[PDB]
Design an enzyme around this catalytic site. Structure first.
Site, PDB file in Angstrom:
ATOM      1  N   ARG A  85       0.852  -1.174   0.000  1.00  0.00           N
ATOM      2  CA  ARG A  85       0.000   0.000   0.000  1.00  0.00           C
ATOM      3  C   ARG A  85       0.898   1.238   0.000  1.00  0.00           C
ATOM      4  O   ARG A  85       1.870   1.313   0.763  1.00  0.00           O
ATOM      5  CB  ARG A  85      -0.882  -0.042   1.251  1.00  0.00           C
ATOM      6  CG  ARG A  85      -1.880   1.089   1.337  1.00  0.00           C
ATOM      7  CD  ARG A  85      -2.841   0.913   2.516  1.00  0.00           C
ATOM      8  NE  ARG A  85      -2.158   0.597   3.790  1.00  0.00           N
ATOM      9  CZ  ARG A  85      -1.441   1.457   4.516  1.00  0.00           C
ATOM     10  NH1 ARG A  85      -1.307   2.726   4.153  1.00  0.00           N
ATOM     11  NH2 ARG A  85      -0.849   1.046   5.635  1.00  0.00           N
ATOM     12  N   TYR A 233      -0.955  -4.492  -5.769  1.00  0.00           N
ATOM     13  CA  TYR A 233      -0.699  -4.975  -4.406  1.00  0.00           C
ATOM     14  C   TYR A 233      -1.715  -4.598  -3.352  1.00  0.00           C
ATOM     15  O   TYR A 233      -2.125  -3.417  -3.225  1.00  0.00           O
ATOM     16  CB  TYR A 233       0.645  -4.446  -3.892  1.00  0.00           C
ATOM     17  CG  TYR A 233       1.237  -5.284  -2.784  1.00  0.00           C
ATOM     18  CD1 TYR A 233       0.870  -5.089  -1.447  1.00  0.00           C
ATOM     19  CD2 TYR A 233       2.181  -6.252  -3.081  1.00  0.00           C
ATOM     20  CE1 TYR A 233       1.414  -5.878  -0.429  1.00  0.00           C
ATOM     21  CE2 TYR A 233       2.759  -7.026  -2.065  1.00  0.00           C
ATOM     22  CZ  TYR A 233       2.372  -6.828  -0.753  1.00  0.00           C
ATOM     23  OH  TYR A 233       2.955  -7.657   0.226  1.00  0.00           O
ATOM     24  N   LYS A 242      -9.165  -1.560   2.364  1.00  0.00           N
ATOM     25  CA  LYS A 242      -8.891  -0.257   2.919  1.00  0.00           C
ATOM     26  C   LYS A 242      -9.730   0.864   2.256  1.00  0.00           C
ATOM     27  O   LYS A 242     -10.309   1.708   2.932  1.00  0.00           O
ATOM     28  CB  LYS A 242      -7.391   0.061   2.804  1.00  0.00           C
ATOM     29  CG  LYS A 242      -6.499  -0.997   3.458  1.00  0.00           C
ATOM     30  CD  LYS A 242      -6.788  -1.130   4.943  1.00  0.00           C
ATOM     31  CE  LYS A 242      -5.682  -1.908   5.661  1.00  0.00           C
ATOM     32  NZ  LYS A 242      -5.973  -2.021   7.138  1.00  0.00           N
ATOM     33  N   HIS A 262     -10.020   0.566  11.952  1.00  0.00           N
ATOM     34  CA  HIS A 262      -8.893  -0.325  11.761  1.00  0.00           C
ATOM     35  C   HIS A 262      -8.698  -1.116  13.034  1.00  0.00           C
ATOM     36  O   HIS A 262      -7.774  -0.885  13.810  1.00  0.00           O
ATOM     37  CB  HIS A 262      -7.672   0.556  11.480  1.00  0.00           C
ATOM     38  CG  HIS A 262      -6.508  -0.185  10.940  1.00  0.00           C
ATOM     39  ND1 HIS A 262      -5.242   0.312  11.030  1.00  0.00           N
ATOM     40  CD2 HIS A 262      -6.412  -1.423  10.304  1.00  0.00           C
ATOM     41  CE1 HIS A 262      -4.380  -0.564  10.438  1.00  0.00           C
ATOM     42  NE2 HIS A 262      -5.084  -1.613   9.997  1.00  0.00           N
ATOM     43  N   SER A 284      -0.799  -0.421  11.665  1.00  0.00           N
ATOM     44  CA  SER A 284      -0.040  -1.387  10.877  1.00  0.00           C
ATOM     45  C   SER A 284       1.313  -1.660  11.550  1.00  0.00           C
ATOM     46  O   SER A 284       1.959  -0.730  12.117  1.00  0.00           O
ATOM     47  CB  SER A 284       0.114  -0.885   9.428  1.00  0.00           C
ATOM     48  OG  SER A 284      -1.139  -0.419   8.943  1.00  0.00           O
ATOM     49  N   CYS A 286       1.896  -3.243  14.312  1.00  0.00           N
ATOM     50  CA  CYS A 286       1.880  -3.214  15.779  1.00  0.00           C
ATOM     51  C   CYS A 286       1.091  -4.377  16.422  1.00  0.00           C
ATOM     52  O   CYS A 286       0.737  -4.313  17.601  1.00  0.00           O
ATOM     53  CB  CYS A 286       1.382  -1.864  16.298  1.00  0.00           C
ATOM     54  SG  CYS A 286       2.460  -0.509  15.764  1.00  0.00           S
ATOM     55  N   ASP A 309      -8.547  -7.070  11.407  1.00  0.00           N
ATOM     56  CA  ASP A 309      -8.016  -5.836  10.755  1.00  0.00           C
ATOM     57  C   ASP A 309      -9.043  -4.717  10.628  1.00  0.00           C
ATOM     58  O   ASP A 309      -8.665  -3.564  10.731  1.00  0.00           O
ATOM     59  CB  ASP A 309      -7.414  -6.181   9.376  1.00  0.00           C
ATOM     60  CG  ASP A 309      -6.682  -5.016   8.724  1.00  0.00           C
ATOM     61  OD1 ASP A 309      -5.635  -4.644   9.265  1.00  0.00           O
ATOM     62  OD2 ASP A 309      -7.163  -4.546   7.660  1.00  0.00           O
ATOM     63  N   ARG A 403       2.992 -11.057   2.601  1.00  0.00           N
ATOM     64  CA  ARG A 403       1.686 -11.361   3.170  1.00  0.00           C
ATOM     65  C   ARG A 403       1.221 -12.777   2.897  1.00  0.00           C
ATOM     66  O   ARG A 403       1.549 -13.373   1.879  1.00  0.00           O
ATOM     67  CB  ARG A 403       0.621 -10.378   2.578  1.00  0.00           C
ATOM     68  CG  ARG A 403       0.893  -8.912   2.935  1.00  0.00           C
ATOM     69  CD  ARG A 403       0.265  -8.504   4.255  1.00  0.00           C
ATOM     70  NE  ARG A 403       0.649  -7.154   4.684  1.00  0.00           N
ATOM     71  CZ  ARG A 403       0.110  -6.524   5.719  1.00  0.00           C
ATOM     72  NH1 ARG A 403      -0.942  -7.072   6.383  1.00  0.00           N
ATOM     73  NH2 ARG A 403       0.561  -5.339   6.054  1.00  0.00           N
TER      74      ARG A 403
HETATM   75  N1  GTP Z   1       7.225  -7.324  21.477  1.00  0.00           N
HETATM   76  C1  GTP Z   1       6.029  -7.695  20.971  1.00  0.00           C
HETATM   77  N2  GTP Z   1       5.858  -7.605  19.629  1.00  0.00           N
HETATM   78  C2  GTP Z   1       4.673  -7.963  19.074  1.00  0.00           C
HETATM   79  C3  GTP Z   1       3.590  -8.452  19.928  1.00  0.00           C
HETATM   80  N3  GTP Z   1       2.551  -8.717  19.097  1.00  0.00           N
HETATM   81  C4  GTP Z   1       2.960  -8.420  17.825  1.00  0.00           C
HETATM   82  N4  GTP Z   1       4.225  -7.998  17.822  1.00  0.00           N
HETATM   83  C5  GTP Z   1       5.054  -7.526  16.686  1.00  0.00           C
HETATM   84  O1  GTP Z   1       4.241  -6.875  15.683  1.00  0.00           O
HETATM   85  C6  GTP Z   1       4.646  -7.225  14.356  1.00  0.00           C
HETATM   86  C7  GTP Z   1       3.515  -8.082  13.744  1.00  0.00           C
HETATM   87  O2  GTP Z   1       2.306  -7.306  13.632  1.00  0.00           O
HETATM   88  P1  GTP Z   1       1.675  -7.129  12.175  1.00  0.00           P
HETATM   89  O3  GTP Z   1       1.073  -8.399  11.692  1.00  0.00           O
HETATM   90  O4  GTP Z   1       2.691  -6.412  11.322  1.00  0.00           O
HETATM   91  O5  GTP Z   1       0.587  -6.040  12.624  1.00  0.00           O
HETATM   92  P2  GTP Z   1      -0.896  -5.718  12.154  1.00  0.00           P
HETATM   93  O6  GTP Z   1      -1.403  -4.745  13.137  1.00  0.00           O
HETATM   94  O7  GTP Z   1      -1.729  -7.018  12.057  1.00  0.00           O
HETATM   95  O8  GTP Z   1      -0.740  -4.958  10.747  1.00  0.00           O
HETATM   96  P3  GTP Z   1      -1.641  -4.853   9.425  1.00  0.00           P
HETATM   97  O9  GTP Z   1      -1.933  -6.242   9.011  1.00  0.00           O
HETATM   98  O10 GTP Z   1      -0.590  -4.234   8.540  1.00  0.00           O
HETATM   99  O11 GTP Z   1      -2.776  -3.994   9.848  1.00  0.00           O
HETATM  100  C8  GTP Z   1       5.919  -8.038  14.579  1.00  0.00           C
HETATM  101  O12 GTP Z   1       7.022  -7.099  14.638  1.00  0.00           O
HETATM  102  C9  GTP Z   1       5.702  -8.663  15.950  1.00  0.00           C
HETATM  103  O13 GTP Z   1       6.900  -9.053  16.623  1.00  0.00           O
HETATM  104  C10 GTP Z   1       3.856  -8.519  21.386  1.00  0.00           C
HETATM  105  O14 GTP Z   1       2.990  -8.926  22.208  1.00  0.00           O
HETATM  106  N5  GTP Z   1       5.074  -8.146  21.816  1.00  0.00           N
HETATM  107  O1  SPV Z   2      -1.379  -1.712   5.860  1.00  0.00           O
HETATM  108  C1  SPV Z   2      -2.281  -2.311   6.561  1.00  0.00           C
HETATM  109  O2  SPV Z   2      -2.762  -1.903   7.688  1.00  0.00           O
HETATM  110  C2  SPV Z   2      -2.759  -3.568   5.980  1.00  0.00           C
HETATM  111  O3  SPV Z   2      -3.635  -4.218   6.605  1.00  0.00           O
HETATM  112  C3  SPV Z   2      -2.238  -4.071   4.632  1.00  0.00           C
HETATM  113  S1  SPV Z   2      -2.992  -3.452   3.243  1.00  0.00           S
HETATM  114  O4  SPV Z   2      -4.274  -4.196   3.182  1.00  0.00           O
HETATM  115  O5  SPV Z   2      -3.089  -1.899   3.377  1.00  0.00           O
HETATM  116  O6  SPV Z   2      -2.170  -3.890   2.137  1.00  0.00           O
HETATM  117 MN    MN Z   3      -2.653  -7.864  10.317  1.00  0.00          MN
HETATM  118 MN    MN Z   4      -4.339  -3.137   8.488  1.00  0.00          MN
END
Ligand code: GTP
Ligand code: SPV
Ligand code: MN
Ligand code: MN
Ligand code: NA
Length: 610
Positions: A85, A233, A242, A262, A284, A286, A309, A403
Site C-alpha cells: 500500500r 498490491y 482499505k 482499523h 499497521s 503493531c 483488521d 503477506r
Molecule cells: N514485542 C512484541 N511484539 C509484538 C507483539 N505482538 C505483535 N508484535 C510484533 O508486531 C509485528 C507483527 O504485527 P503485524 O502483523 O505487522 O501487525 P498488524 O497490526 O496485524 O498490521 P496490518 O496487518 O498491517 O494492519 C511483529 O514485529 C511482531 O513481533 C507482542 O505482544 N510483543
Molecule cells: O497496511 C495495513 O494496515 C494492511 O492491513 C495491509 S494493506 O491491506 O493496506 O495492504
Molecule cells: Mn494484520
Molecule cells: Mn491493516
C-alpha cells in the site's frame, strides 16, 4: 436501441451474461469496458471451478507458482517497485480540501491527501483510456460483511488482474449470490487497472504487471467511487479492504451514525465460561493479527477471532455497540509469524492460501524472517527476489511487508459468531502502539472523552503519531472524526465500551523488551475483563487507572521488572503533553473539538500535581 452496436459488449463476454446483471451494474461494466477496452469480459461467479481454473491459468503464465509442500497453496512474487500500500499515491477527492483533511499550519498534512476534482479528471484521462487493451476485465461482485446482513455493503470491482480476483475471493464474499442479494440496490463502484495495456510499452518484471510512475489510488466519496491505477498490491488493489471498508465507509459511518475502524475483534472466555467481545485498534506493524488469534497462556482462558483488521460497529436498539468483520479472510504480514508468536495463524495458512513475496524452500514450503523453524541440512532457499539465498546474506529472504491471504473460516479459533448478521456486542475498546519509553503495559481511560483523547494520542512507533490507527485511512477531516467519536456519549441509552490503552513495546535502557508479550498478553486481557465486571483491581494515576499491585497474574513471569514496566514518570509525561499539544495544534487546529482540548488541559493539570 443503438445505431451501430452501441456500448454493447456481449460479444466479448467469456463468462456469465451481461443480460443477467442488474441494470446499474451492467451500465458500470459497459461504461468502463468502452473506456478501458478489454479484449474479454469475465463476470465472476465465485465458484470453486472458476477459482481452480483461474489459478491454473496464472500458473500456466508464470504469474503464480504452486507450493508443492501444502494443500492448494500458491506463491506470487512481485516487481520490487510494487510491494505495499503506497500512501503518497493515495488521495481523496472532494469539493473543498478541508472536508477531507484539516489545513496544517506547516503546509503538509499527515492526516490525508486531498486532490481537487479538476486535477483528478486530468490524472484519470492520462491513465485509464485503453488501459486494459489485450486483457480480461474481471467483474467481481462482492459483499463486505456476511451476505444479507443489515450491516453489510456490496461493491462491484472491475480489474484486469486475476491475482486480485483470486485474493478478493478469499478476503470478501464474492460471486453470483452477491449479485442476487444486490438486485437493483446501490453498490460501491470500484475500478482497478494494473496500467499495462498490451502490447507492453515497458518490460515486465517478475511477471508482475504494474505502473509505478502512474500509480494513483483515488476515492471519490461524493460519487461512491474508488478508482485505482498502477499497483497490483494489497490495499492498493483489493478495493474492498482499505479503500471501501475504511475510507469510503468511515465517511458513510459519520453521516449515518456508525463507525468503520482499523480494529481487530476478538471473543474472550474466562474459566467460568463468561464471554465478552473486545475491539482493538493498533497501527499497521503493531500486532493486531497476533492478538486477534492469540493462544492464551493462562489456563482455562480462550480467545476466538472475529476479525483481525477491520471493524464496522453500530449501536443496536438496546444500546449495545455491535461489531461485524466486513472481511472474509486474513491478509496478514508473514514475517515474524511463528509457532511462538501466532500458532493459530501457522495452522490456518497451510491450505487454500496465497502468499506474496515470501521465500520458498527447495521442498516447496514457505520461509521468512522470524519463522523460527530450522530447516533440514541440504534444504535451500529461494528469496522473494527469485535468487538463491543464505542466512548469511545482507538482505532478508522475504519482503518485510510480505503477506499471506487465507480464508477466515479455516482458522481453528474462528469465533462461532464471526458471521452472525447482527454483529457481536463490544464491551471494551483497546488502543495501542509502539512506545519504547514512558508508557506502561496497560491503563484504563477515566471517561469516554478521555478515552477518545487516548485514541487521538496513539503512536505506531515511539516518534510517529497514528491516531486511532487510522492515519492513512481517514475518509474525511480528522477533527470531524473526533467530534463523531465524542458524539457517541450523547446517544441516549448507549452502553459505552470501557476504553483501555496497551503497550507491548516498552524497552529498558539496553533496548530489551520489558514484557514478553504474545500469548502472555492474556494476562492483560484478564485484567480488562475483570475491569468490565467492575472488579476493584485498579489504582488511579494521572494517566488513567492501572492494575493494583498484585492485580495482574504474573505467575510464570517472576523475572519481569515490574517497577520499570509499570512506572509513571512526571518528566516523561510533561514531554508527552507538550508533544501532543504541538501535534494537535499543527495538524488539527481550527478543527479540534473543545472536548479534546479540555482532556489535553486536564492531563496537563494532573501531571502538574505529581
Ligand atoms: N514485542 C512484541 N511484539 C509484538 C507483539 N505482538 C505483535 N508484535 C510484533 O508486531 C509485528 C507483527 O504485527 P503485524 O502483523 O505487522 O501487525 P498488524 O497490526 O496485524 O498490521 P496490518 O496487518 O498491517 O494492519 C511483529 O514485529 C511482531 O513481533 C507482542 O505482544 N510483543
Ligand atoms: O497496511 C495495513 O494496515 C494492511 O492491513 C495491509 S494493506 O491491506 O493496506 O495492504
Ligand atoms: Mn494484520
Ligand atoms: Mn491493516
Ligand atoms: Na511474479
Amino acid at each position: 436501441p443503438q445505431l451501430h452496436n452501441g456500448l454493447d459488449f456481449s460479444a466479448k463476454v467469456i463468462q456469465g451474461s451481461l443480460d443477467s446483471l442488474p441494470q446499474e451494474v451492467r451500465k458500470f461494466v459497459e461504461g468502463n469496458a468502452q473506456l478501458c477496452q478489454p479484449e474479454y469480459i469475465h463476470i465472476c461467479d465465485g465458484s470453486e471451478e472458476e477459482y481452480g481454473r483461474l489459478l491454473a491459468h496464472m500458473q500456466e503464465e508464470g504469474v503464480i507458482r504452486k507450493l508443492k509442500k501444502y494443500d492448494n497453496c500458491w506463491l506470487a512474487l512481485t516487481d520490487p517497485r510494487d510491494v505495499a500500500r503506497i500512501e503518497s499515491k493515495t488521495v481523496i477527492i472532494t469539493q473543498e480540501q478541508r472536508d477531507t483533511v484539516p489545513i496544517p499550519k506547516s503546509g503538509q498534512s499527515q492526516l490525508g491527501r486531498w486532490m481537487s476534482e479538476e486535477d483528478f479528471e486530468k490524472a484519470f484521462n492520462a491513465r485509464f483510456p485503453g488501459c486494459m487493451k489485450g486483457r480480461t476485465m474481471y467483474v467481481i461482485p462482492f459483499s463486505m460483511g456476511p451476505l444479507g446482513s443489515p450491516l453489510a455493503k456490496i461493491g462491484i470491482e472491475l480489474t484486469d488482474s486475476p491475482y486480485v480476483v483470486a485474493s478478493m475471493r478469499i478476503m470478501t464474499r464474492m460471486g453470483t449470490s452477491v449479485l442476487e442479494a444486490l438486485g437493483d440496490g446501490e453498490f460501491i463502484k470500484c475500478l482497478h487497472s494494473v496500467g499495462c495495456p498490451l502490447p507492453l510499452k515497458k518490460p515486465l518484471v517478475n511477471n508482475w504487471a504494474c505502473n509505478p510512475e502512474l500509480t494513483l489510488i483515488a476515492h471519490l466519496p461524493d460519487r461512491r467511487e474508488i478508482i485505482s491505477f498502477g499497483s497490483g498490491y494489497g490495499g492498493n488493489s483489493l478495493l474492498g479492504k482499505k479503500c471501501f471498508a475504511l475510507r469510503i465507509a468511515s465517511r458513510l459511518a459519520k453521516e449515518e451514525g456508525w463507525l468503520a475502524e482499523h480494529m481487530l475483534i476478538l471473543g474472550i472466555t474466562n474459566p467460568e465460561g463468561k464471554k465478552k467481545y473486545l475491539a482493538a485498534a493498533f497501527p499497521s506493524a503493531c500486532g493486531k493479527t497476533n492478538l486477534a488469534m492469540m493462544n492464551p497462556t493462562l489456563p482455562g482462558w480462550k480467545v476466538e477471532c472475529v476479525g483481525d483488521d477491520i471493524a464496522w460497529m453500530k449501536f443496536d436498539a438496546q444500546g449495545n455497540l455491535r461489531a461485524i468483520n466486513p472481511e472474509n479472510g486474513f491478509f496478514g504480514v508473514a514475517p515474524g509469524t511463528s509457532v511462538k508468536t501466532n500458532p493459530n495463524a501457522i495452522k490456518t495458512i497451510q491450505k487454500n492460501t496465497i502468499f506474496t513475496n515470501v521465500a520458498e524452500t527447495s521442498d516447496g514450503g514457505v520461509y521468512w524472517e522470524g519463522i523460527d523453524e530450522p530447516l533440514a541440512p541440504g534444504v535451500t532457499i529461494t528469496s522473494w527476489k527469485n535468487k538463491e539465498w543464505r542466512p548469511q546474506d545482507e538482505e532478508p529472504c522475504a519482503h518485510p511487508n510480505s503477506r499471506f491471504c487465507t480464508p477466515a473460516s479455516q482458522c481453528p479459533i474462528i469465533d462461532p459468531a464471526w458471521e452472525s448478521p447482527e454483529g457481536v456486542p463490544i464491551e471494551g475498546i483497546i488502543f495501542g502502539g509502539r512506545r519504547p519509553a514512558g508508557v506502561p503495559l496497560v491503563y484504563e481511560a477515566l471517561s469516554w472523552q478521555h478515552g477518545v483523547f487516548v485514541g487521538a494520542a496513539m503512536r505506531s512507533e515511539g516518534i510517529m503519531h497514528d491516531p486511532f490507527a487510522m492515519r492513512p485511512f481517514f475518509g474525511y477531516n480528522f477533527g470531524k472524526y473526533l467530534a463523531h467519536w465524542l458524539s457517541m456519549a450523547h446517544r441516549p441509552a448507549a452502553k459505552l465500551p470501557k476504553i483501555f490503552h496497551v503497550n507491548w513495546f516498552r524497552k529498558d535502557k539496553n533496548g530489551k523488551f520489558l514484557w514478553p508479550g504474545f500469548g502472555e498478553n492474556s494476562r492483560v486481557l484478564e485484567w480488562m475483563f475483570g475491569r468490565i465486571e467492575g472488579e476493584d483491581s485498579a489504582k488511579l494515576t494521572p494517566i488513567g487507572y492501572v492494575p493494583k499491585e498484585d492485580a495482574l497474574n504474573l505467575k510464570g513471569l517472576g523475572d519481569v521488572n515490574v517497577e520499570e514496566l509499570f512506572g509513571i514518570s512526571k518528566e516523561f509525561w510533561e514531554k508527552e503533553v507538550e508533544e501532543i499539544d504541538k501535534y494537535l495544534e499543527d495538524q488539527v487546529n481550527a478543527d479540534l473539538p473543545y472536548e479534546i482540548e479540555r482532556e489535553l488541559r486536564a492531563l496537563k493539570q494532573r501531571i502538574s500535581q505529581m
